[PDB]
Design an enzyme around this catalytic site. Structure first.
Site, PDB file in Angstrom:
ATOM      1  N   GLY A 229       9.995   8.498   2.601  1.00  0.00           N
ATOM      2  CA  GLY A 229       8.851   9.160   3.201  1.00  0.00           C
ATOM      3  C   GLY A 229       7.538   8.431   2.982  1.00  0.00           C
ATOM      4  O   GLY A 229       7.473   7.453   2.242  1.00  0.00           O
TER       5      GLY A 229
ATOM      6  N   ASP B 286       9.173   2.210   0.828  1.00  0.00           N
ATOM      7  CA  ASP B 286      10.154   2.101   1.902  1.00  0.00           C
ATOM      8  C   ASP B 286       9.460   2.030   3.263  1.00  0.00           C
ATOM      9  O   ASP B 286       9.935   1.356   4.179  1.00  0.00           O
ATOM     10  CB  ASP B 286      11.143   3.272   1.854  1.00  0.00           C
ATOM     11  CG  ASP B 286      10.478   4.592   1.514  1.00  0.00           C
ATOM     12  OD1 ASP B 286       9.309   4.792   1.904  1.00  0.00           O
ATOM     13  OD2 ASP B 286      11.122   5.425   0.842  1.00  0.00           O
TER      14      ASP B 286
ATOM     15  N   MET C 233      -0.426  -1.589   5.193  1.00  0.00           N
ATOM     16  CA  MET C 233       0.913  -1.583   4.611  1.00  0.00           C
ATOM     17  C   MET C 233       1.719  -2.781   5.116  1.00  0.00           C
ATOM     18  O   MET C 233       1.425  -3.339   6.172  1.00  0.00           O
ATOM     19  CB  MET C 233       1.635  -0.271   4.927  1.00  0.00           C
ATOM     20  CG  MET C 233       1.948  -0.062   6.387  1.00  0.00           C
ATOM     21  SD  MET C 233       2.448   1.637   6.739  1.00  0.00           S
ATOM     22  CE  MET C 233       3.954   1.772   5.790  1.00  0.00           C
TER      23      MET C 233
ATOM     24  N   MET D 208       0.820  -1.211   0.000  1.00  0.00           N
ATOM     25  CA  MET D 208       0.000   0.000   0.000  1.00  0.00           C
ATOM     26  C   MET D 208       0.858   1.266   0.000  1.00  0.00           C
ATOM     27  O   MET D 208       1.826   1.377   0.752  1.00  0.00           O
ATOM     28  CB  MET D 208      -0.944   0.002   1.204  1.00  0.00           C
ATOM     29  CG  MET D 208      -1.880   1.201   1.262  1.00  0.00           C
ATOM     30  SD  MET D 208      -2.768   1.514  -0.280  1.00  0.00           S
ATOM     31  CE  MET D 208      -3.765   0.038  -0.428  1.00  0.00           C
TER      32      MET D 208
ATOM     33  N   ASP E 208      11.473   6.784  -1.685  1.00  0.00           N
ATOM     34  CA  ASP E 208      11.335   8.237  -1.653  1.00  0.00           C
ATOM     35  C   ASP E 208      11.716   8.775  -0.276  1.00  0.00           C
ATOM     36  O   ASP E 208      11.718   9.986  -0.053  1.00  0.00           O
ATOM     37  CB  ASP E 208       9.905   8.657  -1.991  1.00  0.00           C
ATOM     38  CG  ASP E 208       8.951   8.449  -0.831  1.00  0.00           C
ATOM     39  OD1 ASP E 208       8.229   9.406  -0.479  1.00  0.00           O
ATOM     40  OD2 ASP E 208       8.931   7.337  -0.263  1.00  0.00           O
TER      41      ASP E 208
HETATM   42  C1  LIG Z   1      -0.443   0.320   9.297  1.00  0.00           C
HETATM   43  C2  LIG Z   1      -0.707   1.567   8.464  1.00  0.00           C
HETATM   44  N1  LIG Z   1      -0.338   2.749   8.939  1.00  0.00           N
HETATM   45  C3  LIG Z   1      -0.553   3.884   8.223  1.00  0.00           C
HETATM   46  C4  LIG Z   1      -1.175   3.834   6.969  1.00  0.00           C
HETATM   47  C5  LIG Z   1      -1.408   5.131   6.137  1.00  0.00           C
HETATM   48  N2  LIG Z   1      -0.890   4.887   4.811  1.00  0.00           N
HETATM   49  C6  LIG Z   1      -1.695   4.800   3.746  1.00  0.00           C
HETATM   50  C7  LIG Z   1      -3.212   4.936   3.743  1.00  0.00           C
HETATM   51  O1  LIG Z   1      -3.982   3.834   3.763  1.00  0.00           O
HETATM   52  C8  LIG Z   1      -3.784   6.147   3.742  1.00  0.00           C
HETATM   53  F1  LIG Z   1      -3.050   7.226   3.730  1.00  0.00           F
HETATM   54  P1  LIG Z   1      -5.576   6.281   3.750  1.00  0.00           P
HETATM   55  O2  LIG Z   1      -6.203   5.040   4.229  1.00  0.00           O
HETATM   56  O3  LIG Z   1      -6.017   7.435   4.606  1.00  0.00           O
HETATM   57  O4  LIG Z   1      -5.867   6.526   2.273  1.00  0.00           O
HETATM   58  S1  LIG Z   1      -0.706   4.490   2.424  1.00  0.00           S
HETATM   59  C9  LIG Z   1       0.797   4.481   3.234  1.00  0.00           C
HETATM   60  C10 LIG Z   1       2.154   4.234   2.610  1.00  0.00           C
HETATM   61  C11 LIG Z   1       3.175   5.423   2.719  1.00  0.00           C
HETATM   62  O5  LIG Z   1       4.452   4.860   2.923  1.00  0.00           O
HETATM   63  P2  LIG Z   1       5.186   4.040   1.737  1.00  0.00           P
HETATM   64  O6  LIG Z   1       5.126   2.604   2.014  1.00  0.00           O
HETATM   65  O7  LIG Z   1       6.595   4.434   1.665  1.00  0.00           O
HETATM   66  O8  LIG Z   1       4.465   4.348   0.333  1.00  0.00           O
HETATM   67  P3  LIG Z   1       4.896   5.563  -0.685  1.00  0.00           P
HETATM   68  O9  LIG Z   1       5.819   6.529   0.012  1.00  0.00           O
HETATM   69  O10 LIG Z   1       5.623   4.978  -1.900  1.00  0.00           O
HETATM   70  O11 LIG Z   1       3.640   6.270  -1.135  1.00  0.00           O
HETATM   71  C12 LIG Z   1       0.463   4.718   4.582  1.00  0.00           C
HETATM   72  C13 LIG Z   1       1.490   4.796   5.673  1.00  0.00           C
HETATM   73  C14 LIG Z   1      -1.543   2.521   6.508  1.00  0.00           C
HETATM   74  N3  LIG Z   1      -2.173   2.335   5.262  1.00  0.00           N
HETATM   75  N4  LIG Z   1      -1.296   1.454   7.275  1.00  0.00           N
HETATM   76 MG   LIG Z   2       7.726   5.771   0.661  1.00  0.00          MG
END
Ligand SMILES: Cc1ncc(C[n+]2c(/C(O)=C(\F)P(=O)(O)O)sc(CCOP(=O)(O)OP(=O)(O)O)c2C)c(N)n1
Ligand SMILES: [Mg+2]
Ligand SMILES: Cc1ncc(C[n+]2c(/C(O)=C(\F)P(=O)(O)O)sc(CCOP(=O)(O)OP(=O)(O)O)c2C)c(N)n1
Ligand SMILES: Cc1ncc(C[n+]2c(/C(O)=C(\F)P(=O)(O)O)sc(CCOP(=O)(O)OP(=O)(O)O)c2C)c(N)n1
Ligand SMILES: [Mg+2]
Ligand SMILES: [Mg+2]
Ligand SMILES: [Mg+2]
Ligand SMILES: [Mg+2]
Ligand SMILES: [Mg+2]
Ligand SMILES: [Mg+2]
Ligand SMILES: [Mg+2]
Lengths: 553, 548, 548
Positions: free
Chosen positions: C468, C439, C414, C386, C466
């Site tokens: 972040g 990440d 995630m 995610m 990225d």
């Molecule tokens: C266990 C957990 N914690 C936080 C999140 C929040 N989150 C996403 C998410 O679902 C939303 F923002 P919402 O329901 O409000 O639409 S997506 C995401 C991933 C950001 O970190 P990443 O893995 O590095 O991905 P990118 O930087 O490439 O975009 C988070 C943290 C959640 N879903 N689950």
């Molecule tokens: Mg990221």
């Protein structure tokens, strides 16, 4: 030593039946009687009670066992005990337990349950009773380990009686009470020796009292407990600060024992208590919780708010105490009293409010059906300081509550937050069982009456000296008023008439029916002189009720 | 009272009133407004890498300051990822307030995705769990969470914040931080003072609340005045140590040969302070032949084996001070009592195993314990994870001279050490923190190494490496004489730590242990040391435990 | 019926009857007997590094085989660490059975540590949650868990196993694996066949159950016979793709310009297959002007915007086969319908952005998507975590030719990608699995890299780096024009992966992307690739989403 394994008065034993240990524990709690109805799943407890000093009092509906238990709890301060079987036996208690819990009446219900092995099976009568009772009790638990049998029962009474009291529920599986158990009775532990609020906090409030010009005490449930009585009177005589009470603390202070009593607050929007609260620049709450009287109804927010109780305040949008004195109430009030430098000099507005209240009270209606005010006056005549009064829920409740200052009863059970019907008669039976030598008068409507009228048989069987009065209008009037005011039409608030005299007589009790306005007082006077159960039917003209409800919140 | 543009603004202002310095967690759309509002406040935002660790860090802040640490997560998985953390905090009595996002109020009825009944999920493992359904009650509910968390016997609290409530406008005011109860009645204290005088084998059993900072001086005053022996639960492990009190009988809960248990069984008078039966089962120590006195901030939670003859509820510090003022004389130790403590001294001398440098590779546990004692001084905080090492450290806890020791873990949750240390360091950044875990526990929270690096947190994490779940394997070995699911592969923990931008270390020799630890200590920032350990001697240690 | 020495023996025998090939989890004393008993069985023990991932791996096994994957944990934190995993499985309809240890039955009444009310905690996020309090019911309860998990609309199930029940003796027998319902009534099918003939804009809306393996052939038979256009929820993302069916209108749920939505609003007849409103809110597509037909294994979960005029409950495969046999003629597409699908073609042609090699460093998202499409063929399974990349992949899902795609994630949890891949690989070890995460998500489940290495799992994990939480930052940027708690530090992901004993890779150049991925694919075992990404173009993509 309480936990000793070598106590002769409380010996460790190899009990033949868990039920024996349960009854032995109840004895230690000082239980005098138990109310309820037996069933196969719980019959061993009933059986074991035969070999004890504890009296078995069969009721005709379980709901009333809870009501009777609450009355015993409120008076004695020791938890009243209800005893029912599993399934419908338990579920029939739920309203009663909610009623007890909300009024702060200590009640312990022991409810039978299927065997532990039959709980996992999809068998009938295997209710999750603990889940059902949890939202309406302080304490709800099922004994799954026989070793914990005495422990759980003791803890139930402790939860019910200590802190802010409430109702407690215990589920007893059939195999646990029937089967053998190893253990001892746990001696009853009194109220914990708790400390007064901090001295730095007490002097802080004492400073506010001196600097205040319209102080007022707001009394809640815990202020009405016996252990706080002496300390409360000492503080009032030292300060002469005016007082107003919630209905849960209705009997905490009377006008006869304190000059600056402003009546009870909770129902009416034009009480001396309310005016002083709105006028107040400092409000000190004692033994009070917001549930007893919604702060949104009296707290203007313009006044400094002090909280004194055995528990911390549950803060909310209209209740944010500026100062919080948590601890033993009696000890807190005693310390506080020792720091009162001078008695209060009432403001002209404050003094006028209290003057208006007394004068108004110092005040010929031969209309048929009887005018409510006529009935209230007649009740006041027969109810003296040796008579307990219990009040059901309905329009009459408002009438009686409005003129509660002029009733001179020893004790009055009227407080009813859940607004449960049918509480009056069971309350009276419970109250009488505590003081059989005294008479109890109960009052209800025709609606509330028929919801608990089955306990008339219980009353005749007990030779209970109870006089029940019925305000007969053949309908659910307190609901009808609201409908008339909102919709200008009625729905589902009317039903048929009954011969309540003959109805009462079919139980073997004395029946009366007021067929004339002039016969009201003679009939009540006569029904009082009856040494035993008696019922009086009183036709009432509720045409003036819309005027009364306008005085409410 | 003010007309707030967004509910989130009122939330942050309330947090400010509570004296919150930082918040731990991970943002999401449903809660991002609160994160956004924190930008306009003095409150510091600390992004973590897993929500569970936000709860752990929050607990560490809570235990020290006495003010609830704050976790901030989004709805759905953001909340459910907190539950283990919240349960651990609650069982240890750490004040924690978790603010969790939730779907809009209108979408709760539609039964849409991400609409967990979080309140139902958090209730069994918190003191307080509630969802804000009325915007007017927003400030009230938050304040109540802090009060529930911080007051009485502290614990964890959960608040569900619907998106529309924190995003939408609200009318209300901040609630000033408020609880403080007075000391026990004089008549109650004189009653206890009388029992102490007439008693011949008195003993203090210290529980959680006895270990709180506000009670330290009052406790020391009572011990110096009475000289009554002391034994503590592991929740009160740091209340009194062997070095600062002569008649300390060790901590009771794990080992079957502690002075405390013997003294309790011998006792004719037992005074429990800040203690609840959950901390140490009364079935293990309460013979019932002794008069039992209860001193706590709450009434006793009575049990079949815990029915206090006397019950003192109130301010502990004020109660113990008053009690001390009414002790007529110091205790003259009984021959049996003195023999027990003498036996403990010989026991402490035997556990030390005078000399005998253990040359074994992989390193002998006691060797590592000795090395840790050298580097952990009174200016160093120690945090301990769950595993076999926990038992070793717990056993030689008498010989540790640490500032604070976080080791108590009723839930026996693994992976707590590192997040605890980061949380502990944030309260006193100028000081060093040492965390110790196994390889199993390490990897469950190792993601926060990046967070430590981001914070430049001065934390030294030690890993007892056996490449397996040893504490489970031992129990399996004694019961089944074979292993199942307790073995996994090796890792290059040095390079692993260095990939975060932290300092990596690996002990490749028994003689190289102390030089490495000293070198890692001198690192001003995150550092990890991998320590190969030979657990072959563990069955000898586990024999010292309660059959259980 | 047999006199079992230990309850654990009966449990393992029941699992064998269920056709369980492996179990995922972590042992503890309260449950170690079950782990021990698994030694004497054909069932394989797979230790994980965090329980949450056992649930994730179990779900992957469940989705593919249709038989519940099994997680096995100890009590307390062992159980509470599953809750997010179990919620994710339940919302996606993945059959999972978690067996969780619990304290002895006698210690549940004492209120001792580690005595969580797990059943209460798991109930809101499972189909089935129960504690075995009677040893006689041991085999019955386990079988019921599998039935609850696998039958109807599948989901997750939880069983609490007290220590004394699994350790103590028991009398009972194994319950053979059993559910199978018949096709819909002929009179009901002829009724629907009549509506299709009289309809001018029919469309199939495919939900979860339409994507099950047992329904594939029957579904293909109905589409080839009717040539009615199709649109799917993301839970049915892999049921039909653009490449295998000409009149595919894409997946509906995320984007505001899909052919499926337009066709649904245009529809005069909507036949939903295997669909529940939770998969895609009816408020978004159901105009109400169309006759609504419901085909599923359960009766419809009616809603204000979902009241089917006709309701077919029964075997989907048999129902669709019969329905096909009563279609008199193929659909002749309406001008409006044909225009919508034509528009989708032009849309698919515009999204492809013919030519224009994107030379940007860091790498442009579409560049990475193109690179992934090259390496993921019909013999490769793809799992998606995610984040922002999820949106990118979801958008170009029409151009992916993968064996299976695990991407559906209602809870938006995630860290699911890597554990999903390990679980997916274990079902078909001879094949390759590609997992992709950010990440942020990576480090939440990265501990299972060691597990992948231990298993020699042929998994290639890709990281969009990225440094972040980008998907949150974008939403913050549009709403607040500033960032909060979405930034963290960098890492050397190559060395990080290599510290596990896996193959590490890092894309340091745009031109080096494909060569690196191809090199990582040729690795026969675990491999990780770090891919720097420039998300500056993301706001352009998020504009294609439903305001929400
Ligand atoms: C266990 C957990 N914690 C936080 C999140 C929040 N989150 C996403 C998410 O679902 C939303 F923002 P919402 O329901 O409000 O639409 S997506 C995401 C991933 C950001 O970190 P990443 O893995 O590095 O991905 P990118 O930087 O490439 O975009 C988070 C943290 C959640 N879903 N689950
Ligand atoms: Mg990221
Ligand atoms: C168990 C039960 N059912 C209904 C009622 C409603 N009720 C009263 C009540 O509490 C309200 F209407 P509200 O929601 O406004 O608080 S009072 C009352 C008594 C009417 O019957 P009655 O006993 O004959 O009394 P009168 O005719 O003299 O007025 C009812 C039915 C309730 N409280 N409890
Ligand atoms: C979240 C979680 N999962 C599993 C465990 C089980 N466990 C321990 C534990 O508490 C017991 F075994 P029990 O309650 O039954 O006494 S301790 C431990 C640590 C083993 O891995 P390690 O970290 O490498 O430690 P060592 O190898 O050095 O001994 C585990 C896994 C748990 N507590 N929490
Ligand atoms: Mg309750
Ligand atoms: Mg009536
Ligand atoms: Mg503290
Ligand atoms: Mg709770
Ligand atoms: Mg290990
Ligand atoms: Mg499937
Ligand atoms: Mg459920």
């Amino acid at each position: 030593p309480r936990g000793s394994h070598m106590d002769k008065q409380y010996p460790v034993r190899q009990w033949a039946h868990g039920a024996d240990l349960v009854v032995s524990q109840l004895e230690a709690q000082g239980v005098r009687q138990v109310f309820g109805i037996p069933g196969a799943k719980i019959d061993k407890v009933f059986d074991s009670l035969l070999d004890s000093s504890i009296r078995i009092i069969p009721v005709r509906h379980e709901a009333n066992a809870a009501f009777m238990a609450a009355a015993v709890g409120r008076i004695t301060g020791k938890a009243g005990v209800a005893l029912v079987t599993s399934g419908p036996g338990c579920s029939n208690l739920i309203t009663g337990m909610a009623t007890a819990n909300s009024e702060g009446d200590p009640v312990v219900a022991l409810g039978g349950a299927v065997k532990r092995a039959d709980k996992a099976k999809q068998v009938h009568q295997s209710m999750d009773t603990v889940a059902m009772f949890s939202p309406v009790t302080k304490y709800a638990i099922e004994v799954t380990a026989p070793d914990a049998l005495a422990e759980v029962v003791s803890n139930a009474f402790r939860a019910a009686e200590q802190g802010r009291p409430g109702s407690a529920f215990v589920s007893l599986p059939q195999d646990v009470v029937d089967g053998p158990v190893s253990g001892k009775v746990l001696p009853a532990s009194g109220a914990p020796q708790m400390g007064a609020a901090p001295d730095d906090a007490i002097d802080q409030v004492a400073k506010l009292i001196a600097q205040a010009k319209n102080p007022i005490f707001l009394l809640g449930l815990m202020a009405s407990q016996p252990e706080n009585s002496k300390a409360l009177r000492r503080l009032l005589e030292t300060s002469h600060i005016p007082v107003t009470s919630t209905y849960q603390a209705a009997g905490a202070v009377n006008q006869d024992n304190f000059s600056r009593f402003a009546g009870r607050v909770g129902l009416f929007n034009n009480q001396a208590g309310d005016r002083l609260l709105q006028l107040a620049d400092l409000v000190i709450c004692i033994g009070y919780s917001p549930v007893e009287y919604e702060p949104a109804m009296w707290n203007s927010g313009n006044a400094t708010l002090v909280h004194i109780d055995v528990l911390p305040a549950y803060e909310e949008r209209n209740y944010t105490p500026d100062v919080e004195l948590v601890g033993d109430i009696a000890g807190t009030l005693n310390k506080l009293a020792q720091n009162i430098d001078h008695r209060l000099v009432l403001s002209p507005q404050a003094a006028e409010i209290l003057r208006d209240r007394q004068h108004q009270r110092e005040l010929q209606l031969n209309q048929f059906a009887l005018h409510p005010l006529r009935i209230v006056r007649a009740m006041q005549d027969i109810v003296n300081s040796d008579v307990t009064l219990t009040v059901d829920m309905g329009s009459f409740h408002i009438w009686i509550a409005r003129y509660l200052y002029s009733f001179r009863a020893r004790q009055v059970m009227i407080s009813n937050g859940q607004q449960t019907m049918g509480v009056a008669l069971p309350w009276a039976i419970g109250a009488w069982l505590v003081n059989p030598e005294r008479k109890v008068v109960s009052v209800s409507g025709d609606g509330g009456f028929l919801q608990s009228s089955m306990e008339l048989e219980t009353a005749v069987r007990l030779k209970a000296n109870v006089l029940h009065l019925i305000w007969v209008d053949n309908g659910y009037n307190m609901v009808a008023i609201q409908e008339e005011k909102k919709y200008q039409r009625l729905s589902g608030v009317e039903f048929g008439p009954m011969d309540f005299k003959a109805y009462a007589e079919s139980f073997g009790a004395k029946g009366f029916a007021v067929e004339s306005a002039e016969a009201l007082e003679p009939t009540l006077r006569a029904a009082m002189d009856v040494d035993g159960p008696a019922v009086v039917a009183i036709p009432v003209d509720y045409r003036d009720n819309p005027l009364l409800m306008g005085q409410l919140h």
